[PDB]
Swiss-Prot record:
GO terms for biological process: L-tryptophan biosynthetic process. This is Indole-3-glycerol phosphate synthase. PROSITE patterns: IGPS (PS00614). It catalyses: 1-(2-carboxyphenylamino)-1-deoxy-D-ribulose 5-phosphate + H(+) = (1S,2R)-1-C-(indol-3-yl)glycerol 3-phosphate + CO2 + H2O.
Length: 251
């Protein structure tokens, strides 16, 4: 991994030691990026809903994850399931049970630093994974991306600054997440997020992460080329907020 400090250094070391699984996959691989493009063509707003028990920038929520996932099948273009143990309070078993219960695309969100974690994603039923430019060297990124593609997955490559965006394009990313949140401070900068979005080629499937809360914002970002929208904590607390984001409101 790259030179790191603080919590990211900690989580990378934890992830290096994550035990692999021998679960067996019992669903096909269905493309999240392709379903996003389908929604775009159908003029249906594409929201990727997150399941996460905890986020370092949020409070813990203890809800039934299966009940949540099945609700989101009605609305979401896919699910983003957080499996990191220490900071996201996650579990491989939660991913496995949700995957066993739904038919929409699932991204396993964790700090992927070794090939066995991609094996884990496949074996547990996730359709794809995220790779994080902040923590992986160019060489690791390219290797893990190639490895994931060998399973037939298309990873979401997550960036939050210009140099990391260049690296994402350099390594051959086709599916990019533009995060508004700073990894170190937790601060949100939407001006930066939009600047990055404006620099991405049209043929890349683009997902905005963080800072999305209103239909108006979503439509603004669609016009700027964003294809889909990751929305997590807001929905973890009030799932029905997704209705207005997709359908508009009477209110």
């Amino acid at each position: 991994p790259r030179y790191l400090k603080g919590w990211l250094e900690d989580v990378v070391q934890l992830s290096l030691r994550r035990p692999s699984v021998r679960a067996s996959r019992q669903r096909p691989i269905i493309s999240l990026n392709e379903r996003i493009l389908e929604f775009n063509k159908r003029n249906i707003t594409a929201i990727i809903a997150e399941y996460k028990r905890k986020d370092p920038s949020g409070l813990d929520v203890e809800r039934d994850p299966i009940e949540y996932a099945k609700f989101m099948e009605r609305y979401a273009v896919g699910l983003f399931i957080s499996t990191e143990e220490k900071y996201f309070n996650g579990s491989y078993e939660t991913l496995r049970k949700i995957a066993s219960s739904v038919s929409i695309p699932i991204l396993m969100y964790d700090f992927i630093v070794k090939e066995s974690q991609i094996d884990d994603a496949y074996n547990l039923g996730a359709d794809t994974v995220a790779l994080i430019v902040k923590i992986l060297t160019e060489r690791e990124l390219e290797s893990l991306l190639e490895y994931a593609r060998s399973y037939g997955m298309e990873p979401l490559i997550i960036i939050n600054d210009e140099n990391d965006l260049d690296i994402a394009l350099r390594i051959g990313a086709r599916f990019i997440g533009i995060a508004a949140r700073d990894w170190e401070t937790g601060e949100i900068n939407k001006e930066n997020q939009r600047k990055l979005i404006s620099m991405i080629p049209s043929n890349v499937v683009k997902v905005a992460k963080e800072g999305i809360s209103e239909r108006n914002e979503i439509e603004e970002l669609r016009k700027l080329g964003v294809n889909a929208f990751l929305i997590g904590s807001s929905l973890m607390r009030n799932p029905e907020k997704i209705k207005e984001l997709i359908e508009g409101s009477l209110e």
